Design a protein around this ligand. Structure first.
Ligand SMILES: *[C@@H]1O[C@H](CO)[C@@H](O[C@@H]2O[C@H](CO)[C@@H](O[C@@H]3O[C@H](CO[C@H]4O[C@H](CO)[C@@H](O)[C@H](O)[C@@H]4O)[C@@H](O)[C@H](O[C@H]4O[C@H](CO)[C@@H](O)[C@H](O)[C@@H]4O)[C@@H]3O)[C@H](O)[C@H]2NC(C)=O)[C@H](O)[C@H]1NC(C)=O
Ligand SMILES: *[C@@H]1O[C@H](CO)[C@@H](O[C@@H]2O[C@H](CO)[C@@H](O[C@@H]3O[C@H](CO)[C@@H](O)[C@H](O)[C@@H]3O)[C@H](O)[C@H]2NC(C)=O)[C@H](O)[C@H]1NC(C)=O
Ligand SMILES: *[C@@H]1O[C@H](CO)[C@@H](O[C@@H]2O[C@H](CO)[C@@H](O[C@@H]3O[C@H](CO)[C@@H](O)[C@H](O)[C@@H]3O)[C@H](O)[C@H]2NC(C)=O)[C@H](O)[C@H]1NC(C)=O
Ligand SMILES: *[C@@H]1O[C@H](CO[C@@H]2O[C@@H](C)[C@@H](O)[C@@H](O)[C@@H]2O)[C@@H](O[C@@H]2O[C@H](CO)[C@@H](O)[C@H](O)[C@H]2NC(C)=O)[C@H](O)[C@H]1NC(C)=O
Ligand SMILES: *[C@@H]1O[C@H](CO)[C@@H](O[C@@H]2O[C@H](CO)[C@@H](O)[C@H](O)[C@H]2NC(C)=O)[C@H](O)[C@H]1NC(C)=O
Ligand SMILES: *[C@@H]1O[C@H](CO)[C@@H](O[C@@H]2O[C@H](CO)[C@@H](O)[C@H](O)[C@H]2NC(C)=O)[C@H](O)[C@H]1NC(C)=O
Ligand SMILES: *[C@@H]1O[C@H](CO)[C@@H](O[C@@H]2O[C@H](CO)[C@@H](O)[C@H](O)[C@H]2NC(C)=O)[C@H](O)[C@H]1NC(C)=O
Ligand SMILES: *[C@@H]1O[C@H](CO)[C@@H](O)[C@H](O)[C@H]1NC(C)=O
Ligand SMILES: *[C@@H]1O[C@H](CO)[C@@H](O)[C@H](O)[C@H]1NC(C)=O
Ligand SMILES: *[C@@H]1O[C@H](CO)[C@@H](O)[C@H](O)[C@H]1NC(C)=O
Ligand SMILES: *[C@@H]1O[C@H](CO)[C@@H](O)[C@H](O)[C@H]1NC(C)=O
Ligand SMILES: *[C@@H]1O[C@H](CO)[C@@H](O)[C@H](O)[C@H]1NC(C)=O
Ligand SMILES: *[C@@H]1O[C@H](CO)[C@@H](O)[C@H](O)[C@H]1NC(C)=O
Ligand SMILES: *[C@@H]1O[C@H](CO)[C@@H](O)[C@H](O)[C@H]1NC(C)=O
Ligand SMILES: *[C@@H]1O[C@H](CO)[C@@H](O)[C@H](O)[C@H]1NC(C)=O
Ligand SMILES: *[C@@H]1O[C@H](CO)[C@@H](O)[C@H](O)[C@H]1NC(C)=O
Ligand SMILES: *[C@@H]1O[C@H](CO)[C@@H](O)[C@H](O)[C@H]1NC(C)=O
Ligand SMILES: *[C@@H]1O[C@H](CO)[C@@H](O)[C@H](O)[C@H]1NC(C)=O
Ligand SMILES: *[C@@H]1O[C@H](CO)[C@@H](O)[C@H](O)[C@H]1NC(C)=O
Ligand SMILES: *[C@@H]1O[C@H](CO)[C@@H](O)[C@H](O)[C@H]1NC(C)=O
Ligand SMILES: *[C@@H]1O[C@H](CO)[C@@H](O)[C@H](O)[C@H]1NC(C)=O
Ligand SMILES: *[C@@H]1O[C@H](CO)[C@@H](O)[C@H](O)[C@H]1NC(C)=O
Ligand SMILES: *[C@@H]1O[C@H](CO)[C@@H](O)[C@H](O)[C@H]1NC(C)=O
Ligand SMILES: *[C@@H]1O[C@H](CO)[C@@H](O)[C@H](O)[C@H]1NC(C)=O
Ligand SMILES: *[C@@H]1O[C@H](CO)[C@@H](O)[C@H](O)[C@H]1NC(C)=O
Ligand SMILES: *[C@@H]1O[C@H](CO)[C@@H](O)[C@H](O)[C@H]1NC(C)=O
Ligand SMILES: *[C@@H]1O[C@H](CO)[C@@H](O)[C@H](O)[C@H]1NC(C)=O
Lengths: 615, 93, 53, 54
């Protein structure tokens, strides 16, 4: 009858979190003993056993598109890119007018393939003035350059061996620090104390909505955020079924997110080797120009195994039957930015743009076997670019250095971000074509399972117990109220595992060989997250001490619970609320309960007793 | 500055073995019951902190842009927490 | 004298500058000193948490 | 110019106090230095950032 309020802590609670993530990687990334290949900062190496504890008979919502993970991810990536850009020498004096020659003393100029690229060989050899190490001393020296790096100055009649950099007139340019490469590493993003990751192991579960097969995790699976447009490389496959998602299926403008079931090889290759020439321009500033290449300069081409691509497309178009039986159309990108016009990526630092040539040459509308029969080893052209404006950051550009040696490039396929044409009929037929504008789409594609989650150990409940008056990370709770009292020791211990994260930092100044300062938003905000978590725990312990509940988690209350609550049995409260529906019912009155337990429990405390005692 | 520590001689002795800051203008007995009004907000820096929303940026995009202001604010938080920590440690002692 | 690092901190007087004038002048030294303060505090904080447990 | 070696003779307008004649300019259209350049450096004021009070 008597509804004595009772407070509990360390109780499993899961809510929407908005906090800072922490970079990490496997031990192999740090044992490479290189300063940094493109993630290997002094980030905390992964725990020897990040616990992934299952949890059944639960429910949780998901909105993968509204997740704040990719925001901080690309922010920290751009910060690390700027940090690696800092030690690079600048290329501002290179902007002088030059004189180049297209036809050179090499054998091949027209390869076997012709796709409007043989004449556009993008191979010229060019002379250029460069200042010597001394101030007044200069000298003209020659090297090899592509056509995409510059453009013929149209101020005169024609080119006439007169060119200008495309990015110089817009902004500055600096080298890409060739000792740093641009290869991917599995990146695991860990959460602070009081926060965790929630993964949904259901395969049919789409990117949003409710899920039940919960897995609580400390650090995400190692992601490889490969820069890839119109395609995903080395990403997780949708096992058991091809996953198709979108922000708004009714809206054609939204990207069509895809995650495939299998992978296929892509042999994109520049067979002819590359060279390097370190010409000193200034007092310790040297440019590593692309020297004279040895051998016949074969046109950098690419090849794709269309046999397995036919099976992949068969499974996809089997999956593309959203609200139809037989109707689909495939098209190419008619035009736009170069990232969207062609499948863009980087392979070792050189920005490899291997074409989406044979993508639109397919239509699985009536007979799927009609597209499975023509097993076509798709040979195609693949171009290379030396400069790029990352994330529309038109500032100090980055020059891709030589990659010396014959260039092979293999890359899995796991997802094609298609886009529906708005300039077409609605129900007569559906058109899809590749689009690679937003890079964040490819990054959130692998995060539809993982979602950051907050831990709120606070708990209240009415029971018949009362004190004397004066005068298993987060699991094993799908429907329980009594089981939480048993796990008050394990969950409290796991609630404050941040010291284990801080122990393995190894952030004295540097990890592998040598670094600059390189202390930026990542580390300082990690320390800020530590400070704020410690402050949250401090305020919690302060509220415990105010109520006298700092000695134990179980803490009674002097004031009985009011009758404003809707009638309900204690057994029904204990059996079928999992501690969460009850907190949903006392959402607004929780502040009143706090005020009551803070004021009446303290001010109504008498001083002593004198009548009877052992004396 | 605020020094919440206060002392006074009275007859009360423990057993031996063998409204931000107002609501007391001039009081000592009535001020001996309004203590929690100051203690609840003494360690409530998270209230002022929750409204920051400095994830990276606010409007489109910014550079690193973390300078004497933010780091001094963090240091002020740390030292204000250390003061009350030493206080509570002395209380437990 | 266990958690009495505030005695060492009180004499710092790093308001912005000390002697004549300076630039921003806050680098690995000061920030890692603050990190060491925070970690030394956090160690005994978790210890006292285990005590309360 | 945007190119390195290219130079162009372009014209603008300057205040009367921001510069001072040089080279013993008794009576002629002699050159003019900046009042603060020989003392210290100078850079643009980042026009997107306004200097109004809040
Ligand atoms: C650094 O230098 C480069 C190269 O000069 C600039 O990049 C672009 O340069 C072109 C040429 O000056 C700019 O103009 C474009 O012209 C296209 C057609 O070219 C003919 O017509 C122009 C006169 O308009 C002649 O000068 C030229 O010789 C040719 O005879 C147009 O098709 C362009 O506009 C249309 O197409 C684009 C692309 O499809 C669409 O996006 C537009 O909406 C429009 O439909 C354009 O007018 C071009 O503007 C320059 N680019 C940019 C972004 O401005 C760099 O601009 C320069 N750096 C800086 C900072 O200016
Ligand atoms: C990537 O590959 C696609 C597919 O090949 C290219 O798009 C377009 O491909 C068609 C192929 O028929 C080109 O049309 C043909 O052009 C030749 C040469 O002018 C002509 O003789 C044929 O009769 C036919 O018209 C079309 O030109 C081409 N589009 C463009 C803009 O050139 C795409 O160009 C390729 N992209 C890259 C970067 O390689
Ligand atoms: C997806 O993952 C695979 C495997 O991790 C990547 O394969 C990589 O392929 C490149 C060539 O295509 C290999 O390059 C070689 O690296 C060695 C390193 O010493 C170097 O000596 C050689 O001269 C050559 O450059 C690379 O080793 C290989 N494996 C890696 C990086 O682990 C593949 O590149 C990934 N996909 C994408 C899109 O990056
Ligand atoms: C660039 O300046 C030169 C030199 O002129 C002097 O310097 C200027 C900055 C300005 O202060 C003038 O009043 C000075 O007299 C200009 O003169 C010609 O420069 C070219 C290239 O060196 C040379 O071949 C000519 O003989 C010079 N002619 C004269 C009469 O001095 C030059 O014109 C300026 N640039 C442009 C694009 O006009
Ligand atoms: C996308 O495919 C279309 C074919 O449907 C290509 O269209 C041709 O474009 C060239 C331009 O080089 C024209 O000369 C042809 O007349 C066009 N033919 C047709 C039938 O439209 C288009 O070029 C392709 N674009 C890309 C970027 O691949
Ligand atoms: C407990 O709940 C009851 C009913 O919900 C509250 O009764 C209120 O009493 C005042 C008179 O003091 C009336 O003006 C209100 O209209 C009553 N409430 C309702 C909903 O009619 C009672 O105040 C509550 N007590 C506490 C301590 O919360
Ligand atoms: C706590 O108070 C909020 C304040 O409105 C309540 O929110 C409303 O809840 C009703 C149904 O419970 C909804 O129909 C309204 O739309 C909600 N308001 C808004 C603005 O959306 C909430 O329900 C209260 N919760 C409890 C347990 O009493
Ligand atoms: C090109 O190579 C072929 C053999 O592959 C050879 O017969 C021919 O003479 C070569 N031409 C030049 C210009 O080197
Ligand atoms: C080369 O061009 C011709 C006509 O321009 C075309 O028929 C042929 O398909 C092209 N080669 C390749 C490999 O596409
Ligand atoms: C192109 O050449 C012709 C003939 O030499 C000339 O008249 C014309 O001015 C030139 N175009 C330019 C300078 O833009
Ligand atoms: C639910 O997650 C657990 C994690 O241990 C896994 O073993 C199980 O197969 C998952 N079930 C489904 C239906 O995804
Ligand atoms: C995802 O699935 C849910 C049902 O589980 C559905 O309501 C929702 O519309 C789906 N998402 C999209 C984008 O259609
Ligand atoms: C590419 O796909 C194969 C399976 O087809 C897989 O074994 C391999 O690990 C993938 N490559 C990655 C993840 O880099
Ligand atoms: C390919 O996808 C289909 C449906 O999308 C799925 O049934 C099949 O198992 C997948 N293939 C695998 C996992 O090898
Ligand atoms: C999706 O877009 C259609 C129109 O394109 C709109 O009517 C509908 O409300 C949208 N649904 C959602 C969930 O945004
Ligand atoms: C090229 O394709 C075949 C498999 O289809 C094989 O030689 C190899 O796996 C591929 N090599 C790459 C993509 O570098
Ligand atoms: C096909 O791919 C292979 C594997 O890299 C390559 O050697 C060949 O040149 C490609 N092109 C063909 C067979 O036309
Ligand atoms: C879709 O149409 C094909 C005919 O190409 C048919 O074989 C298949 O059974 C149909 N599937 C449906 C209606 O689910
Ligand atoms: C697919 O494209 C081909 C030409 O590439 C065309 O002949 C065919 O009609 C198209 N089929 C559909 C269903 O769009
Ligand atoms: C597939 O081809 C068969 C004949 O081979 C035809 O009868 C059938 O209608 C075609 N499928 C569709 C969906 O039209
Ligand atoms: C393509 O390969 C398949 C093997 O699955 C074979 O049955 C078919 O006849 C081949 N088609 C052609 C045109 O070679
Ligand atoms: C030229 O190519 C060969 C491949 O046969 C390679 O061994 C050599 O290192 C290359 N030359 C360079 C990188 O100077
Ligand atoms: C598409 O919708 C129109 C009316 O909006 C209807 O007349 C037509 O029959 C529909 N298409 C099919 C294949 O039924
Ligand atoms: C899930 O396990 C059993 C069987 O479904 C169920 O009775 C229980 O309430 C659920 N929650 C748990 C085990 O935490
Ligand atoms: C509460 O849950 C148990 C086990 O899941 C079930 O047997 C019982 O019927 C439920 N009672 C309700 C929903 O009132
Ligand atoms: C302040 O002092 C006056 C005079 O002793 C007294 O009347 C008043 O109640 C005091 N408290 C206030 C103003 O809060
Ligand atoms: C710098 O120029 C100004 C203006 O004439 C004047 O102070 C003086 O001439 C120069 N300064 C010195 C220290 O000579």
């Amino acid at each position: 009858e008597n509804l004595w309020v009772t407070v509990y802590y360390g109780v499993p609670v899961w809510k929407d979190a908005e906090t800072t993530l922490f970079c990490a990687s496997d031990a192999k990334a740090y044992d490479t003993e290189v300063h940094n290949v493109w993630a290997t900062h002094a980030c905390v190496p992964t725990d020897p056993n990040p616990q992934e504890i299952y949890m059944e008979n639960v429910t949780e919502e998901f909105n993968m598109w509204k997740n704040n993970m990719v925001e901080q991810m690309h922010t920290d990536i751009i910060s690390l890119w700027d940090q690696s850009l800092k030690p690079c020498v600048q290329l501002t004096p290179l902007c002088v007018t030059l004189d180049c020659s297209y036809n050179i003393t090499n054998n091949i100029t027209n390869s076997i393939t012709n796709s409007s690229v043989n004449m556009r060989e993008e191979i010229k050899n060019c002379s250029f003035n460069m200042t010597t190490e001394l101030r007044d001393k200069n000298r003209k020296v020659y090297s090899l350059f592509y056509k995409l790096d510059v453009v013929q100055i149209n101020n005169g009649n024609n080119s006439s061996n007169l060119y200008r950099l495309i990015n110089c007139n817009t902004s500055a340019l600096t080298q890409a620090c060739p000792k740093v490469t641009f290869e991917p590493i599995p990146i695991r993003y860990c959460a602070p104390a009081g926060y965790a990751i929630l993964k949904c192991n259901d395969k049919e579960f789409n990117g949003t909505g409710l899920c039940k097969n919960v897995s609580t995790v400390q650090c995400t699976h190692g992601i490889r955020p490969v820069v890839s447009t119109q395609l995903l490389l080395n990403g997780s496959l949708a096992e058991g079924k091809v996953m198709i998602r979108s922000e708004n299926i009714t809206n054609n403008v939204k990207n069509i997110i895809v995650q495939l079931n299998e992978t296929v090889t892509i042999n994109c290759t520049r067979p002819n080797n590359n060279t390097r020439k370190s010409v000193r321009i200034g007092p310790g500033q040297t440019f590593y120009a692309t020297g004279d290449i040895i051998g016949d300069i074969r046109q950098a081409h690419c090849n794709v195994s269309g046999s397995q691509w036919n099976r992949a497309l068969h499974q996809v178009v089997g999956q593309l039957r959203e609200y139809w039986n037989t109707t689909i159309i495939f098209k190419n990108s008619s035009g736009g930015d170069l990232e969207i016009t062609t499948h863009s990526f980087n392979c070792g630092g050189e920005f490899f743009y291997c074409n989406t040539s044979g993508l639109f040459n397919s239509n699985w509308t009536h007979n799927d076997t009609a597209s499975m029969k023509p097993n076509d080893t798709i040979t195609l052209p693949c171009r290379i670019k030396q400069i790029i404006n990352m994330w529309q950051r038109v500032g100090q550009a980055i020059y891709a250095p030589p990659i010396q040696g014959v260039i092979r490039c293999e890359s899995n396929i796991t997802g094609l971000i298609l886009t529906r044409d708005g300039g077409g009929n609605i129900n007569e037929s559906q058109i899809f074509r590749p689009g690679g504008g937003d890079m964040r789409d490819n990054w959130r594609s692998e995060l539809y399972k993982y979602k950051v989650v907050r831990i709120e150990p606070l708990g209240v409940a009415p029971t018949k117990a009362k004190r004397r008056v004066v005068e298993g990370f987060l699991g094993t709770a799908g429907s329980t109220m009594g089981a939480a009292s048993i796990t008050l020791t394990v969950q409290v211990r796991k609630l404050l595992s941040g010291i284990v994260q801080q122990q393995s930092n190894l952030l004295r100044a540097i990890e592998a060989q040598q670094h600059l300062l390189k202390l930026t938003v990542w580390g300082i905000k990690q320390l800020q997250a530590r400070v704020l978590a410690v402050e949250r725990y401090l305020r919690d312990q302060q509220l415990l001490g105010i109520w006298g509940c700092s000695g134990k988690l179980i803490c009674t209350t002097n004031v009985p619970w009011n009758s404003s609550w809707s009638n309900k049995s204690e057994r029904e409260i204990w059996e079928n609320m999992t501690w969460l529906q009850w907190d949903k019912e006392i959402s607004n009155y929780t502040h009143i309960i706090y005020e009551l337990i803070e004021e009446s429990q303290k001010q109504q405390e008498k001083n002593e007793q004198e009548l009877l005692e052992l004396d």
